[PDB]
Paper text:
The [name] fusion protein F is a class I fusion protein present on the viral surface and essential for viral entry. It is initially synthesized as a single chain precursor F0, which is cleaved by host cell proteases into disulfide-linked F2 and F1 subunits, with the latter bearing the fusion peptide at its N-terminus. F mediates the fusion of viral and host cell membranes through a large conformational change from the metastable prefusion (Pre-F) to the highly stable postfusion (Post-F) conformation. Since Pre-F is the target for neutralizing antibodies, development of an efficacious [name] vaccine is aimed at stabilizing this conformation.
To better understand the roles of cleavage, F2 truncation and substitutions in stabilizing the [name] Pre-F protein, we determined the structures of double-cleaved Pre-F trimers using single-particle Cryo-EM. For a detailed look at the C-terminus of F2 we focused on two variants, [name]-2c with the additional furin site (90RRRR) and [name]-[name] with an alternative furin site (91REKR) with higher similarity to the native sequence. A stable class of Pre-F trimer particles was isolated and refined by imposing C3 symmetry. These structures were resolved to 3.3 Å and 3.1 Å respectively and showed high similarity, with a root-mean-square deviation (RMSD) of ~ 0.55 Å. Our structures showed the long HR2 stem up to residue Gly487, making them the most complete [name] structures to date. While the exact mechanism remains uncertain, our study provided insights that lend support to the double cleavage hypothesis. Unlike previously described structures, the Cryo-EM structures of the Pre-F trimers in this study show a distinct interprotomeric interaction involving the novel F2 C-terminus. Biochemical assays and the Cryo-EM structural analysis confirmed that the postulated F2 C-terminus truncation agrees with the natural folding of the native closed trimer.
Residue numbers in the entry:
A (entry chain H), B (entry chain G), C (entry chain I): 103 to 487
D (entry chain B), E (entry chain A), F (entry chain C): 19 to 92
The structure:
Amino acid sequence: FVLGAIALGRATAAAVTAGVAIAKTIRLESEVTAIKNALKTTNEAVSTLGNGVRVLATAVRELKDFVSKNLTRAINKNKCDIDDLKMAVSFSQFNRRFLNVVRQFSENAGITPAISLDLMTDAELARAISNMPTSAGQIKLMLENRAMVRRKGFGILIGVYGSSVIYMVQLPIFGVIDTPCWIVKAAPSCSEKKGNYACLLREDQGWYCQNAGSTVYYPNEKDCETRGDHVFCDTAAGINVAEQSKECNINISTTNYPCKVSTGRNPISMVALSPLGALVACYKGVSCSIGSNRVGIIKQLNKGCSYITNQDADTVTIDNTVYQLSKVEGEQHVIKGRPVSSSFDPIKFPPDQFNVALDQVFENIENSQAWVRKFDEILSSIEKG
Amino acid sequence: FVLGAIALGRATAAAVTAGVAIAKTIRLESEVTAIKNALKTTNEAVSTLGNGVRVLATAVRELKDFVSKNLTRAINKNKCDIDDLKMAVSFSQFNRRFLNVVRQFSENAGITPAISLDLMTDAELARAISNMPTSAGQIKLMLENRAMVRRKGFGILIGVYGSSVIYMVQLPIFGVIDTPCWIVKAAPSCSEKKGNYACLLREDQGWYCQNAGSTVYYPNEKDCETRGDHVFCDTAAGINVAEQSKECNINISTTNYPCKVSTGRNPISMVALSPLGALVACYKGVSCSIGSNRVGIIKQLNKGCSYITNQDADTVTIDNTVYQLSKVEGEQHVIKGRPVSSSFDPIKFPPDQFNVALDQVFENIENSQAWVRKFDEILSSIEKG
Amino acid sequence: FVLGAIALGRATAAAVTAGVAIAKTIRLESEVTAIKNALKTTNEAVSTLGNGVRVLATAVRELKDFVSKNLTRAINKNKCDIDDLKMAVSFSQFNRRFLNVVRQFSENAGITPAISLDLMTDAELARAISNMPTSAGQIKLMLENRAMVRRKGFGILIGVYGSSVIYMVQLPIFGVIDTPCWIVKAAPSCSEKKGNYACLLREDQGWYCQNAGSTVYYPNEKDCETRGDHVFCDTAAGINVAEQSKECNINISTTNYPCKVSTGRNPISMVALSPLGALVACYKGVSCSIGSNRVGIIKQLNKGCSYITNQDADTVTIDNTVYQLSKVEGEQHVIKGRPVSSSFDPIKFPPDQFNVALDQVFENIENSQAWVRKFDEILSSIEKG
Amino acid sequence: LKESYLEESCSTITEGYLSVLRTGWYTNVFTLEVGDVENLTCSDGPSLIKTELDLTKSALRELKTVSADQLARE
Amino acid sequence: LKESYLEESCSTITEGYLSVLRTGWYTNVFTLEVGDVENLTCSDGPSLIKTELDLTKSALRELKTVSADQLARE
Amino acid sequence: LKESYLEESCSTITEGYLSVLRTGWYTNVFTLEVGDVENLTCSDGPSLIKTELDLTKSALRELKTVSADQLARE
Ligand SMILES: *[C@@H]1O[C@H](CO)[C@@H](O[C@@H]2O[C@H](CO)[C@@H](O[C@@H]3O[C@H](CO)[C@@H](O)[C@H](O)[C@@H]3O)[C@H](O)[C@H]2NC(C)=O)[C@H](O)[C@H]1NC(C)=O
Ligand SMILES: *[C@@H]1O[C@H](CO)[C@@H](O[C@@H]2O[C@H](CO)[C@@H](O[C@@H]3O[C@H](CO)[C@@H](O)[C@H](O)[C@@H]3O)[C@H](O)[C@H]2NC(C)=O)[C@H](O)[C@H]1NC(C)=O
Ligand SMILES: *[C@@H]1O[C@H](CO)[C@@H](O[C@@H]2O[C@H](CO)[C@@H](O[C@@H]3O[C@H](CO)[C@@H](O)[C@H](O)[C@@H]3O)[C@H](O)[C@H]2NC(C)=O)[C@H](O)[C@H]1NC(C)=O
Ligand SMILES: *[C@@H]1O[C@H](CO)[C@@H](O[C@@H]2O[C@H](CO)[C@@H](O)[C@H](O)[C@H]2NC(C)=O)[C@H](O)[C@H]1NC(C)=O
Ligand SMILES: *[C@@H]1O[C@H](CO)[C@@H](O[C@@H]2O[C@H](CO)[C@@H](O)[C@H](O)[C@H]2NC(C)=O)[C@H](O)[C@H]1NC(C)=O
Ligand SMILES: *[C@@H]1O[C@H](CO)[C@@H](O[C@@H]2O[C@H](CO)[C@@H](O)[C@H](O)[C@H]2NC(C)=O)[C@H](O)[C@H]1NC(C)=O
């Protein structure tokens, strides 16, 4: 069970499926007649559909008013070669929004993947947020960060009923706020005895959240996105994990949870940048060093893994490359221990594995010497016994 | 072999390779002189290149007629401060198509990934489809759905040959229509005996198609896209599979084809939405229930897997999360049986596997038993016998 | 380890991290006052930030001049219904650039993924390139290929400080040019003995480069892009590999480097297009042929894998499909040998494996055979001896 | 925030963030009205109003061949 | 359509679709003519036609450094 | 270029390319000035300058709630 492949497609598939399931209801002729009867005297009205879902209906009448009163009063004898020059310039300002919606639906085949400023302007994005069905403290947060609510929507085309384009816009509701999170990053950890290596690497990386006592795990980091401290996640792309899945960060070797690792026998050298530093893994054939921006080279690292605080350096170099660190304030720590890979004999290490629990590598090795010593005892008792 | 990764890149790589191998012929000086001699009289002519392929040549002359006739006669004394205001506004309407081609080819490095209304308009898209080299039944399908033919093209820049931009547009030919298809979905299938588990999961999920007596399999779901019943597949991203591969849907257990699975030892709880329902796996730590839009919670599910018809519910909940079912109309059937996972002993289950045929999980268990019996027979026969 | 997954995310995450880390310095009120005090008389000056970095500061004053000189004198009585029509057609030509920047930072929530022609025009892209800190050999190459330098930037919003939008643009520096490269492609290699198969596939496919004696390996092919001969790679997405890793192209079996393979027990039939040809794997069920654009079919291929030069054919067919070979001039060579998978026995071939070295598929076969041979001697000496 | 360097497994953990989770969708329905631009004609020849009118009429006539999630047969 | 729930393996199969498969490509070659905008010059100072003329000339000049697949360096 | 068909392993290797590698970033800082559009008002009714001016003022007022970092919750 590779948790990174079970996910990867759930968040997008479950968002289109929930949007086409309600366009199938407004598309009728019973609803469209009922919607446009709420908007005959006002420019906005809240209506309830037939399947119980409530929506917000809003009307646009800038181009219809111009055509009805101004234009259809100078084009009398079918003569449009008039010398006014103000109607012909005003007409090209009013229909600028109409022609920009028609281009977005006609090129995206009826479903656009984002809400441009022509579908939903900024004055109408703050009237939708003020109506959403959620508490008062969530509304206030959304109103000052509207650019992150527009960023996760889409549009769908309903039809052309007479002479009026109808369409709908789906917006997210951020109903749960201020609940703890954290992030885990990893790099290979190798050993060596007389030229043989025994590698190891963690595989439970990504974001974790709490929510009223149940932990969730978002494996594909295209789901989440930070702005400062806050993290903007999508609850349809996570996988519930047990409560004691946080014992992998305290005693990995000797828990009862199945911590997931990937093993090997050939070293890899890499830099894995973390939010407040970087992890540098330097091995046999590679040379590394760190430096600053004003001066330059400061010192050179040793073989193995090491932690480079972002208050020590500004660049980290792997044999020819330069990675710029991130300048974020915080406080670091170091937790002592003896690396797990120091416990393996480099000979008699199992073959390459891919997302197996750490209990099975220890069981695989032990099951092997169980039989060799079983055979050695039966061997003597036959001839000598 | 992991069939989902052998693919994943063939569809887009095989389209650009064929696009650039034909631009390399029109870019000669021998072919451009031949194309521009076809359009000296008309505005469209079907011409054959020098390597046997046939193209369609079309010319755009709205701007050149303004500059030739209307414009370079109001500018005689190199004076452009006239009191006209009709040329100053007309000339800002004629060069809005020209200035929007130059913007798209200059930010995309010369190869745009979609056809806009500025490259190929809508009256020149229904003149291409009327000419394609296919039968009359297929043309009628494309002429009514022109928005799904534009969706899969691109443009490539040939040059600026004097004072005239030349480019090219690649359009798809949907030459095979109305052939059977189907889709497969899956979720984990766990078991238990006094606290230990034995999971299992299918790994052949995606779209299959007949085509004149040959099944194909599209493993990455970015390749196919439904509109109602029809599904718009790409034939360069699929892998031919044997005709017996549909036997996996009748008895996965005792068959002869190699059915692909992935095993485990720790439960996963999730919801996998299918086109006419949902599949809900509830296990040792999660609480599941279903409900409807109007009345709320309806009932609470049991432990294990179960199938939820979209005529019975509207939303499904996994411990905190609400998924919205789809309201497509169809049929449903349930095919009884005893799950495969009930046939395994939770102890003496093989370690975690990734895309192995189910034929080998039974062979792995049976090999290990035979050695124990073989070794045991010796122990009794060296002393007692 | 699986090298294709340790990568896949490094290139984009390192680019954004190094961009926000330097907008955090330009956003101080101490640095914004220093920038705007360099542009008090000129329109471009080179300024050093507070942490030792150098930037290039440039100012845009086309709209401020119109509002200060021309627009304000006409509107003196608050009567902006003047009958001029030149102050109302001009004022819509001057704020097209301002109203397009506000449109791109407001839908992308402050970070845009590419440089448009509104953030940085083309005359200001040849003034940054003339200033970059690199040698004159590289600067000249970047000026005839400016469209490939705009393609890999992005922009970030600093703020609105009074009445002046401030933003910044990141551009790449191509500091190393003309250093050798190559590319590797693969296809399955199967064999039969009385109906049983023994597959095999390579896993080190992608781009490799040299750099002053050190080889790098770019596993994900969304990173590199060819234009002619040159390859545009990103140095932050590669993995330093040993110099012996070019012995897998000379001797794959008897070498001592760990060459990665994936195995199986069921054939696959596919076509893998290479730069100057194609590799066609035709097995037990599929029928293949090659053709031309003029003279139709040419011949029918045999079973096993074969190499098709792009001077013999223009199309290759797999049972119903057509693939277009690339038309590029080069040289073709054939290196004789006997395939590796003809040395295996289809019985006692190990189960499916995913990215394991080829030294271990030979050990797995040897270890299981040693126990069988050992076990038959012990039985004899019990009684026969 | 606060970052720990777990030495035993060679990894790190950064705590101190806060969450903002999506829990549903809200729907807005628009009705963009165009008027009676299908009855107005031009009979003088080229001009600015005629070009704008042709553009608007053609946009309406084009938006009727696009379907969100159904095909068109018969 | 029609959907079966296969209990034995906990999966489900939906049948009843129809296919629309791509089988080739078609090429349309355009020719966006512009005219003689290189022999038009202005001398009266700022105006509207001058701005539009300069925009058109600059676009033509900058389109000659873009290549589909070849490096212009040489 | 030059392509070898490696028969033993069933693969191919193509040699003869040249590399163009990125090694750093360069930062350009802009400053797009707008003037004093906040001090100009309109007291007639609908016209063209009024529409343009209202667009410009609204764009300034809108851009001040967009952040590339540090959510504005305060
Ligand atoms: C299209 O035609 C209508 C009339 O058929 C024009 O209506 C004009 O509307 C404005 C304001 O809506 C009015 O002019 C002035 O309005 C201000 C504030 O409302 C008022 O204080 C003044 O006394 C004056 O009434 C008036 O209703 C009308 N203007 C007239 C009759 O001169 C409309 O202007 C036309 N469209 C365009 C684009 O001009
Ligand atoms: C650019 O080209 C010529 C300028 O030489 C303009 O052609 C002029 O426009 C039309 C099209 O032929 C003609 O209008 C006339 O209208 C009367 C109304 O009854 C009708 O009877 C005529 O049959 C004709 O349609 C006009 O005579 C014609 N002038 C000439 C000398 O041919 C064209 O309009 C210009 N375009 C611009 C400035 O945008
Ligand atoms: C905004 O207002 C300013 C001044 O009020 C306008 O500048 C004026 O336009 C040009 C540019 O300097 C000058 O034109 C003149 O043309 C004659 C032609 O022979 C030439 O002899 C002069 O040397 C000059 O080039 C004009 O003098 C200039 N006025 C001043 C006082 O400098 C500007 O055009 C206005 N903005 C717009 C968009 O029109
Ligand atoms: C264009 O005008 C025609 C009349 O010349 C309209 O046709 C009639 O419109 C009235 C409403 O104004 C309806 O009650 C009639 O049923 C219509 N008759 C027919 C035969 O259609 C037509 O609706 C106008 N077009 C538009 C787009 O409004
Ligand atoms: C701009 O004008 C020049 C001459 O004033 C044109 O150059 C001549 O073009 C003719 C073709 O019409 C050729 O026969 C001559 O040999 C050209 N002369 C020279 C010196 O080259 C030029 O073609 C005009 N520009 C455009 C775009 O037509
Ligand atoms: C709009 O005009 C007002 C004056 O009516 C400006 O307010 C004053 O601006 C000057 C700058 O020249 C300051 O020295 C004064 O302290 C301002 N007065 C007050 C009470 O604040 C205002 O700055 C103008 N708006 C803009 C955007 O410049």
